[PDB]
Amino acid sequence: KPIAEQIGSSFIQHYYQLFDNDRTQLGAIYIDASCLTWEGQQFQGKAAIVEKLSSLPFQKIQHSITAQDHQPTPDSCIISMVVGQLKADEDPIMGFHQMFLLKNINDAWVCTNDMFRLALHNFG
Amino acid sequence: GDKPIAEQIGSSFIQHYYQLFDNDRTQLGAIYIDASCLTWEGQQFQGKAAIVEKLSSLPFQKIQHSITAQDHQPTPDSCIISMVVGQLKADEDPIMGFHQMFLLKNINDAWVCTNDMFRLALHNFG
């Protein structure tokens, strides 16, 4: 597999393992200039992002990846786009779309730009 | 001073992109450069000429897209990244959700698409 899929796929396995288990380790994949758009709402900077992810109203969450597309950029970044499904506590499974822009800063691949959206919802 | 620069540039590009796609998709090569990368349904197309041939060959005569959601953010390199979630109706096929991502960059005073990733929904409703 290409190097952008290699890195890409490891990032999203890291990301979803941490979200699902210890999501107070999610701060380490973001820098201070990072931008998160969660369900149309914009959170700027590490502190605002880590506060938004820690405030989410659930105790247990599990994600599954249906498909993941990775691409190199001309400026040496990686774009990772995911389609999947999640189950928060005992609520119905919901679909989700999630997009990540990775940059290698100080010898580590960090997320500068993250956008998340729940699927449409056909009911409820 | 109001609405934000990434949202203005992104949203105008989205608008342009889907009007061209739904009217004449063969004029979509003007938005791409030589370094552009398209991922379409998991398949990987590098460069303008391979992207335009891919786009021109899709097997539909009429398409209509409708954007349910669009999220835009400036990046640290000064690019604009956009994520689109919506629906589409090609020919008389069922309505299908899609998701598309675009990376825009300002090269020689011109907003160009370097990176594009499209993926149809994997399930329908019928």
| CATH at B104 | 3.10.450.50
Inform me whether the C-beta atom of residue A79 falls under 8 Å from chain B C-beta atoms.
yes
* B83·A99 Cβ contact <8 A: yes
Q: Could you give the number of structural domains in chain B? A: 1
The verdict on a CB contact (< 8 Å) between A42 and B73 is yes
CB A83 within 8 A of CB A95: yes
Return d(Cα B89, Cα A12) in angstroms, integer: 31
Round to whole Å and give the CA distance between B24 and B90.
14
Provide the token pair at A40: 């149309």
Contact A56, A46 (CB under 8 A): no
Q: Which domain holds residue B46?
A: 1-126
Other beta carbons within 10 Å of A115: 28
**Cβ atoms of B120 and B96 closer than 8 Å:** yes
- Are B73 and A115 a contacting pair at CB < 8 A? yes
